[PDB]
Design a protein around this ligand. Structure first.
Ligand SMILES: CCCCCCCCCCCCCCCCCC(=O)OC[C@H](COP(=O)(O)OCCN)OC(=O)CCCCCCCCCCCCCCCCC
Ligand SMILES: CCCCCCCCCCCCCCCCCC(=O)OC[C@H](COP(=O)(O)OCCN)OC(=O)CCCCCCCCCCCCCCCCC
Ligand SMILES: CCCCCCCCCCCCCCCCCC(=O)OC[C@H](COP(=O)(O)OCCN)OC(=O)CCCCCCCCCCCCCCCCC
Ligand SMILES: CCCCCCCCCCCCCCCCCC(=O)OC[C@H](COP(=O)(O)OCCN)OC(=O)CCCCCCCCCCCCCCCCC
Ligand SMILES: CCCCCCCCCCCCCCCCCCCC
Ligand SMILES: CCCCCCCCCCCCCCCCCCCC
Lengths: 480, 504, 100, 55
């Protein structure tokens, strides 16, 4: 169908981000300026947030055969935009240490945010595939932005090869699903079945290959092995973006796909996703046990947390608060990962060159960075699901969702993995306050510190008083 | 209306202890002293105005004071506090032990002393919150609230003679035990709330509405088991006791940390308030297993306490054995055994507080904790070995101290219900005498086994001597006149017992 | 009068062969070549599916697929050139410094 | 015979099993890209076979 003016005002964050990409590119072509191009990118992202306000003033409707805009789309668009803004704020001091061109970073961040918005609004296999690719390719550039450094180049090569393989798997599964079902819309994947024949072999196989691609993208077991390497090797603001925005957007489009598709309530897919959720929780928590690297630890942490989210997804067709749980948990996980990777980014900034080491050395951080140590230990408590933190509110939502749906193996997996998480998270949080033998001055570094401090305050306040976040996520309802 | 202030005065006091460190390093101990003094005085005023001796049993719910304020209305979660006699006794006990913990951490002034005091006050406020919260999510929230200041107290301010890694290991063991047990309790709470919603159609985490929730025997047994595992880690109940001697040995060497967090018994109160009323039939069928676990806890704790070369580990295993007695008492159907359990909780709090404080003073004097490195310290120290003799006599179970009143009323009621377990527990009293005399012989009597033991050690100052003598006076008065405590806890204990025995 | 099963089976054969080439080849260039074989097989499957149903959506899916193939091939060959310029060696096993 | 707490040891063996299983699972993170592709294809085979078996 055509695009009406109503369809245009619903399209506003996508249009503003695309116009920001064009404007930032033209400003780069006019003169290579770090400060003004960073300012233009963050202005475009803030304008996209206000555009989300204007979208909320409009209704919920299908802008294309491809896109559908509702409160779900607005919420996940806002999450993606917040992660992108924080990535730009963390990226400026790190890029100030950089020597080469430092504005293509902002161009790639904006294009990846555009892909995140498309995945938030994706109602089609077309927009799902295109949003995944628009997330991935600028992240190929961003992960290997410091390609002269050996670890960044290695992480770039690994992420590029493995994401190309995963996109091939996802595309082939999409093709098999389209071979079975003559329409590519989310609502039509399984409509031409009845009398208990939902388990069509070709539809199941296509959804399995799509599961392979999406589980690569979500660091789900057994498509998880890339995660600690790409997290450690990438630049620290790139690690922030890859931890938050990519996982949030892809898991949101997986929510909408499994909510809308009539094959989403298949028993075989539910059992396979339950196996993947169990293995993801247990394996990520067990593999983060003996890590001295903070970025690898956060990678295995992301594996476990996405396993918890997948547990919340399994009960989508049985309970009712699955979308609510996923929204609350994703807000909490966003703020926790923003704080933790922001502390890692601020202590790795400015860039020290491709030859110099980029080790965090979190031991004894309190004696020279007390506020950063407090922020990092608040994040470590939140990712552990400690009460008084928003991560506990998300964990409580996941546990309630699993208990309602009688997913007892998954609930026990959450308990066991949470205990293992308690071990390694508290190890980091208490190593912050020990004593170490040995081993800024601009407002952008202070802005990054303000961002991680506001994330800490949000985690604490919404852990103590989670009702505003629950009220916000409850009114962000998709089309029934 | 004072119960929110009963929880909030410790938290505001801890915030002020942190904030007024800038005017001085000797200031945060003072602010901690006033805030625990006001908490104790508010609890005492609640005792005086409550009229707990005159009130009669009318069945759960029956609260002398109450407070409600909506917190998470989506789930039907509210800040819902309520106080009765048992909760009041526990709150007065934790206020008194908080004052003694502030007094025990005196003359220990260094940088970030205000953070130590803030962690102390947050532990104490969480303990008060567990004793006051009568909706399940807030009860669980306060249950997991104490463990983070507790963890940072053990790991950062712990035993300074340790390697630094053993303190972190003990803190991590304690935190993992307590939080995994709390998570299992949260699963039980969530499943109970969902069963109630499927029965009625309304969200409530309120304990009053969750009573008489219709459910089958297997589901009720599983919910009771989740609650019991959470209460069994923190009681402690064998074999979930392993965190306790390591947490005590690595705790801050004043011992105020033990009094504030490790030594109060929120688990026995939790069993009495939320296991027997919420799941009476399941507790009735679980009573033989829990009573035999209590018997094994008594004898295992006694044998462990005899085998220790460490004073602090010895006293931790004494706590294990006495809580075995309380666990036997709780699963009886006797009002007399429950009143004995209440007296036993208060008296064991007082006696173990005195023991831990005296061990901290002894370590300050001699700079070692090995019983094989000291002997004949009666001839060297002025006040300490006699007061330690009194407290070993008190934890032994001697009449004239409240421990005897608690143990013997427990055993009288238990013999009315279950004779064999009572007989074996009295032989547990024999074992308790064995370990108390063993500790007294190894520490203060005999000849000096080292050079530090053969030296004149400085006497106790007036503050520490006065807090020890206050504990002595309270224990003796509890032993000879335990009637005000029984009159306070009578109505609450009668409500719990009449609920437990009439639904089976 | 061509079955859809035959076109889908041919696409699956090509996908499997491309994945085999991606796994067993140690040269990074041959890994990129196998990636192209894989994504071309996926696009062939989409074209077969679209041509069975008589819809234009299969060729649009092919167009998006080859746009991705072009862009990811350019990125992969830039990374290959950077690896060759930094190490003078196209060994994918040697670029393995990051490990668990 | 009980001087070194046996119940504490038989409650501490889950930590030993956790460390052992974590060290065993860390062998998969060898850092080799070809093994990562092989693991993705193995997981694809497993997921497809599970979907065909369960139906
Ligand atoms: C405060 C606690 C923490 C919260 C964290 C939140 C994180 C995500 C941030 C973005 C979230 C956006 C969610 C929007 C959901 C909207 C759902 C909806 O349907 O709203 C409808 C409502 C208008 O009502 P109605 O009359 O129904 O309109 C339709 C009638 N035709 O329309 C609306 O209500 C419009 C909503 C506009 C939202 C604009 C957001 C601007 C940016 C706010 C950032 C806050 C700071 C967070 C990060 C801090 C730094 C780290
Ligand atoms: C490692 C620690 C974590 C361990 C894993 C997590 C807990 C596992 C619990 C397993 C429970 C198995 C239940 C088996 C039957 C399930 C199907 C069924 O028929 O359930 C009955 C009922 C639902 O049927 P309905 O018609 O709605 O009846 C309502 C009234 N009962 O069901 C209900 O109404 C709700 C049933 C609730 C079941 C218990 C949930 C709480 C469990 C407490 C903790 C686990 C047990 C104790 C600790 C063990 C050792 C760690
Ligand atoms: C009686 C049965 C019925 C009741 C069951 C109740 C279950 C819940 C309550 C009990 C929980 C028991 C947990 C026991 C382990 C506690 C953790 C611990 O010991 O940590 C210390 C230790 C670090 O010390 P160290 O050995 O020096 O370190 C070597 C590595 N550098 O750490 C390590 O070595 C690594 C620690 C790994 C993470 C913690 C262990 C998690 C194990 C699973 C937790 C859930 C258990 C469920 C039930 C299991 C069977 C009882
Ligand atoms: C990393 C490795 C280490 C960490 C991980 C280790 C393993 C962790 C998981 C341990 C727990 C496993 C699951 C235990 C719960 C099993 C539940 C079950 O089988 O339920 C079946 C049935 C459900 O009841 P149902 O029949 O629906 O009732 C309606 C009509 N009767 O139930 C019933 O009818 C009632 C059954 C009651 C007994 C079952 C529970 C036994 C619990 C054993 C441990 C606790 C023992 C007691 C306390 C010890 C001291 C604290
Ligand atoms: C309310 C937040 C609770 C979790 C965050 C904890 C951090 C709070 C702020 C920093 C506290 C620093 C304490 C350092 C003590 C070091 C003592 C060293 C000498 C013994
Ligand atoms: C290596 C880590 C392993 C963690 C395992 C956690 C397991 C938790 C306990 C699961 C219990 C499931 C019980 C299911 C009972 C189903 C009864 C159905 C009746 C119709």
């Amino acid at each position: 169908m055509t695009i009406t003016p109503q369809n245009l005002i619903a399209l506003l964050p996508l249009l503003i981000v695309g116009l920001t990409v064009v404007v930032v590119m033209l400003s780069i072509a006019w003169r290579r300026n770090h400060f003004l191009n960073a300012t233009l990118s963050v202005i475009g992202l803030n304008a996209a947030l206000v555009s989300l306000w204007f979208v909320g003033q409009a209704g919920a409707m299908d802008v294309t055969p491809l896109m559908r805009v509702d409160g779900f789309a607005m919420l996940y668009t806002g999450l993606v935009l917040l992660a992108s803004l924080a990535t730009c704020t963390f990226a400026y001091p790190w890029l100030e240490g950089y020597n080469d061109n430092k504005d293509e970073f902002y161009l790639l961040v904006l294009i990846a945010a555009l892909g995140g918005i498309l995945l938030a609004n994706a109602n089609h296999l077309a927009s799902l595939f295109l949003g995944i690719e628009l997330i991935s390719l600028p992240l190929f550039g961003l992960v290997g932005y410091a390609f002269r450094q050996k670890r960044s180049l290695e992480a770039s090569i690994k992420y590029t090869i493995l994401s190309a393989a995963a996109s091939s798997f996802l595309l082939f599964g999409m093709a098999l699903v389209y071979a079975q079902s003559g329409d590519l819309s989310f609502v039509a994947l399984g409509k031409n079945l009845g009398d208990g024949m939902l388990n069509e072999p070709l539809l199941l196989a296509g959804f399995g290959l799509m599961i392979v691609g999406l589980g690569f993208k979500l660091s789900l077991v057994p498509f998880h092995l890339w995660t600690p390497d790409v997290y450690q090797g990438a630049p620290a603001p790139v690690s922030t973006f890859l931890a938050t925005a990519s996982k949030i957007a892809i898991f949101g489009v997986v929510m909408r796909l499994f909510l809308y598709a009539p094959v989403g309530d298949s028993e075989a897919i539910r059992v396979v996703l339950a196996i993947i959720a169990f293995a993801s929780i247990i394996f990520g928590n067990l593999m983060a046990l003996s890590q001295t690297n903070i970025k690898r630890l956060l990678g295995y942490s992301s594996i476990s947390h996405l396993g918890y989210l997948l547990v919340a997804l399994i009960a989508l067709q049985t309970g009712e608060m699955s979308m609510e749980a996923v929204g609350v948990y994703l807000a909490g996980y966003l703020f926790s990962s923003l704080g933790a990777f922001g502390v890692v980014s601020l202590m790795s900034s400015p860039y020290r060159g491709p030859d110099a080491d980029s080790l965090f050395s979190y031991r004894g951080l309190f004696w020279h960075r007390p506020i950063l140590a407090a922020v990092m230990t608040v994040m470590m408590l939140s990712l552990a699901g400690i009460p008084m933190t928003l991560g506990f509110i998300g964990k409580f939502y996941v546990l309630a969702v699993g208990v309602q749906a009688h997913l007892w193996w998954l609930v026990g997996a959450v308990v066991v993995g949470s205990a293992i998480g308690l071990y390694y998270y508290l190890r980091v949080a208490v190593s912050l306050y020990l004593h170490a033998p040995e081993q800024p001055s601009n407002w952008q570094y202070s802005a990054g510190g303000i961002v991680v401090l506001i994330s800490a305050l949000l985690v604490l306040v919404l852990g103590v008083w989670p009702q505003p976040l629950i009220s916000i996520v409850r009114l962000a309802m998709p089309l029934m | 209306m004072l119960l929110p202030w009963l929880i909030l005065i410790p938290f505001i006091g801890g915030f002020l202890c942190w904030q007024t460190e800038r005017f001085g390093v000797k200031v945060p101990r003072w602010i901690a002293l006033i805030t625990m003094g006001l908490t104790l005085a508010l609890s005492l005023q609640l005792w005086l105005q409550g009229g707990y001796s005159l009130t009669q049993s009318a069945g759960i719910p029956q609260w002398q004071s109450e407070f409600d304020m909506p917190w998470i209305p989506r789930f039907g979660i509210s800040i819902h506090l309520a106080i009765d006699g048992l909760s009041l006794l526990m709150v007065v006990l934790t206020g008194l032990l908080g004052v003694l913990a502030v007094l025990c951490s005196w003359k220990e002034i260094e940088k970030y002393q205000g953070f130590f005091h803030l962690n102390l006050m947050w532990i104490l406020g969480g303990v008060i919150g567990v004793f006051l919260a009568i909706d399940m999510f807030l009860f669980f929230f306060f249950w997991e609230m104490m463990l983070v200041p507790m963890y940072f107290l053990i790991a950062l301010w712990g035993h300074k003679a340790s390697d630094g890694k053993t303190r972190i290991t003990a803190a991590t063991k304690f935190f993992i035990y307590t939080q995994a047990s709390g998570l299992v309790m949260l699963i039980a709470i969530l499943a109970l709330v969902f069963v109630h919603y499927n029965a009625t159609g309304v969200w409530t985490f309120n304990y009053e509405e969750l009573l008489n929730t219709p459910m089958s025997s297997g589901v009720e047994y599983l919910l009771m088991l989740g609650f019991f595992i959470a209460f069994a880690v923190k009681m402690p109940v064998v074999p979930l006791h392993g965190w306790l001697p390591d947490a005590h040995s690595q705790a801050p060497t004043a011992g105020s940390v033990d009094l504030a967090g490790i030594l109060l018994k929120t688990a026995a109160y939790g069993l009495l308030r939320f296991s027997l009323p919420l799941f009476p039939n399941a507790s009735a069928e679980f009573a033989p297993i829990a009573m035999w676990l209590g018997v094994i806890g008594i004898f295992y704790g006694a044998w462990m306490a005899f085998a220790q070369t460490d004073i602090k580990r010895l006293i931790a295993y004494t706590s294990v054995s006495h809580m075995g007695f309380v666990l036997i008492a709780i699963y009886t159907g006797s009002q007399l055994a429950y009143q004995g359990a209440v007296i036993q909780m208060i008296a064991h709090g007082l006696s173990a507080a005195g023991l831990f404080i005296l061990c901290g003073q002894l370590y300050e004097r001699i700079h070692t904790r090995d019983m094989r490195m000291m002997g004949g310290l009666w001839s060297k120290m002025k006040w300490l070995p006699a007061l330690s003799l009194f407290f070993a006599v008190a934890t032994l179970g001697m009449p004239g101290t409240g421990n005897f009143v608690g143990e013997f009323m427990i055993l009288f009621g238990s013999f009315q219900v279950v004779p064999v377990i009572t007989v074996i527990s009295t032989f547990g009293l024999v074992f308790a005498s064995v370990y108390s005399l063993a500790m007294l012989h190894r520490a203060y009597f005999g000849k000096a086994k080292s050079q530090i033991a053969s030296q004149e050690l400085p006497g106790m100052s007036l503050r520490e001597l006065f807090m020890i003598l206050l504990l002595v006076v309270l224990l003796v008065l509890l032993g000879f006149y335990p009637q005000p405590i029984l009159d306070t806890s009578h109505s609450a204990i009668g409500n719990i017992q009449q609920w437990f025995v009439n639904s089976v | 009068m061509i079955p859809l099963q035959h076109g889908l089976i041919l696409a699956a054969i090509l996908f499997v062969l491309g994945l085999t080439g991606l796994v067993i080849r140690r040269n990074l260039l041959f890994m990129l070549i196998g990636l192209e074989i894989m994504i071309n097989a996926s696009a062939l499957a989409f074209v077969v599916a679209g041509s069975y149903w008589g819809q234009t959506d299969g060729q649009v899916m092919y167009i998006l697929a080859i746009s991705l193939a072009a862009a990811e091939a350019s990125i992969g060959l830039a990374l290959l050139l950077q690896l060759h310029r930094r190490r003078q060696n196209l060994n994918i096993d040697s670029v393995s410094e990051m490990r668990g | 015979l009980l001087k070194r707490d046996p119940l504490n040891s038989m409650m501490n063996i889950p930590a030993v099993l956790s460390r052992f299983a974590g060290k065993g699972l860390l062998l998969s993170e060898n850092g080799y890209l070809r093994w990562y592709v092989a693991s993705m294809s193995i997981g694809a085979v497993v997921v497809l076979a599970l979907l065909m078996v369960l139906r």
